[PDB]
């Protein structure tokens with residue numbers, strides 16, 4: 001699709017068997033999902049933005065379907081106010097900015 | 100241009116006669132620039148990021164060039180980690196997200 005930016009670029013994702021709404025975020029290096037259980041091992045990480053930092057759990061090799069497109073990579077899980085799809089997974093679905 | 104996302108989508112902007120670097124940020128409603136002087140009065144705004152809320156100075160009808168494209172609109176000034184071009188000005192330069 002071509003997504004205009006009049007409104008927040010929200011899409012449906014599937015992760016860990018659950019459907020969620022997530023924000024396609026070119027200003028995020030990483031993907032961060034509201035706290036949930038994911039399979040396998042994790043390690044703690046600090047991620048920052050406006051307002052400072054939060055502690056998250058890092059899971060590697062996680063598969064997410066993003067608007068019907070399958071991607072795999074690192075997914076961080078923690079107290080984010082919004083589900084965020086960052087560049088590490090946007091690249092995998094071939095996402096580009098165009099103007 | 101068509102911008103892939105393997106690196107941060109950084110561009111050159113020009114605002115108040117100064118060249119700066121800023122991030123094209125589909126995950127931002129608003130445009131936030133690190134502290135600088137802008138003409139006119141400002142008004143208060145609280146903005147939220149992944150870490151919490153911060154107060155910024157809101158300046159309306161600011162002229163800004165973004166990767167060679169002219170925009171005129173609201174610019175928030177405050178402590179952002181990185182200068183960010185949000186959807187309010189991304190729409191003005193005709194930017195879309197494609198995959």
Ligand SMILES: CCCC[C@H](NC(=O)[C@H](C)NC(=O)[C@H](CCC(=O)O)NC(=O)[C@H](Cc1ccccc1)NC[C@H](CC(C)C)NC(=O)[C@@H](NC(=O)[C@@H](N)CCCNC(N)=[NH2+])C(C)C)C(N)=O
Nearest residue numbers: 027028029047048049050126127128129145146147148181
């Ligand atoms: C129209 C105006 C509405 C009024 C106002 N609106 C807002 O506050 C809206 C919701 N906030 C936003 O739009 C803000 C940008 C600020 C702004 O636009 O004002 N967007 C954001 O903060 C979005 C995520 C988000 C989206 C919506 C809500 C909350 C959060 N991320 C933008 C931010 C830009 C960064 C360069 C500073 N990116 C990040 O924070 C990402 N972090 C990173 O990419 C790493 N660099 C951080 C890790 C560093 N440490 C390390 N690697 N060890 C994070 C998503 C993983 C309000 N008060 O409600």
